[PDB]
Design a binder for this molecule. Structure first.
Ligand SMILES: COc1cc(OC2CCN(C)CC2)ccc1Nc1ncc2c(n1)n(C1CCCC1)c(=O)n2C
Length: 255
């Protein structure tokens, strides 16, 4: 059994949840036997722009948690020249792992999750943040609630199935996140992303930008859900619905 120290407080490591870019996420217990998630970041090989991207995301995370409970909690952190330790909220599972494990999703569960994703993404937009790389792995289930875990600021790896056509053309506005959220809801509706069937990545990238390539929206009992999907997956950002409009949509309002 291994331990860690964060700002004088001792944490015993239970297990490693994940491992990213020079990073590890651990499930830990504090002195009062409370469960937390500790994100460890190794700063050994990080350059000044990478460091500035890390500091900037921490500051936004720290500031934005007061504005919405749909943003993961950041309780404390320890930052040196060698590492970052972030004491965070521990969730049950990320949305990507949950969706991959589940056969059929409940329409009520789908709707509450969609409301949470809208509230979290709306919060970051109000602060001038466009995520631009939204995917289900950016969301965490904490007591039947979805929380955004990151803001896309700091430097499902390289997935293209949630990419807006304008991100492919450029290589970004708040509308880019609407397309990505639309793809997540489409996955929660039909069990696949709109272009998932296209295995070849270049042929898939061409389909996402092609106006002639029609996205299929098969008939479902929830007509409002079908409408949200069609409104989100408009290839022209100017013709795409906004987050404030999605928040007043019958799909999230009509009980
Ligand atoms: C119970 O602990 C979990 C288990 C879990 O299940 C994963 C399913 C797939 N396997 C391969 C790994 C565990 C996902 C998230 C969590 N909780 C959690 N709670 C808090 C987390 C956090 N994850 N993550 C990453 C998201 C993906 C991996 C780590 C974080 O960055 N924080 C702050």
């Amino acid at each position: 059994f291994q331990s860690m120290s964060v700002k004088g407080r001792i944490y015993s490591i239970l297990k490693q949840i994940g491992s990213g870019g020079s990073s590890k996420v651990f499930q830990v217990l504090n002195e009062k036997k409370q469960i937390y998630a500790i994100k460890y970041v190794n700063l050994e090989e990080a350059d000044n722009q990478t460091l500035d991207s890390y500091r900037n995301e921490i500051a936004y995370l720290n500031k934005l948690q007061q504005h919405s409970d749909k943003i993961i909690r950041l309780y404390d952190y320890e930052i040196t020249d060698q590492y970052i330790y972030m004491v965070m909220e521990c969730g049950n599972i990320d949305l990507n792992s949950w969706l991959k494990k589940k056969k059929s999703i409940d329409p009520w569960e789908r709707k509450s999750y969609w409301k949470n994703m809208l509230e979290a993404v709306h919060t970051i937009h109000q602060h001038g943040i466009v995520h631009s790389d939204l995917k289900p792995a950016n969301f965490l289930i904490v007591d039947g609630m979805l929380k955004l875990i990151d803001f896309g600021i700091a430097n499902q790896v390289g997935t293209v199935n949630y990419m807006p056509p304008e991100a492919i053309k450029d290589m970004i506005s708040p509308k880019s996140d609407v397309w990505s959220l639309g793809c997540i809801l489409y996955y929660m509706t039909y069990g696949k992303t709109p272009f998932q069937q296209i295995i070849n990545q270049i042929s898939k990238l061409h389909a996402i930008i092609d106006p002639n390539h029609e996205i299929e929206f098969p008939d479902i009992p929830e007509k409002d859900l079908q409408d949200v999907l069609k409104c989100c997956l408009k290839r022209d950002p100017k013709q795409r619905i906004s987050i404030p409009e999605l928040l007043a949509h019958p799909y999230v309002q009509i009980q």
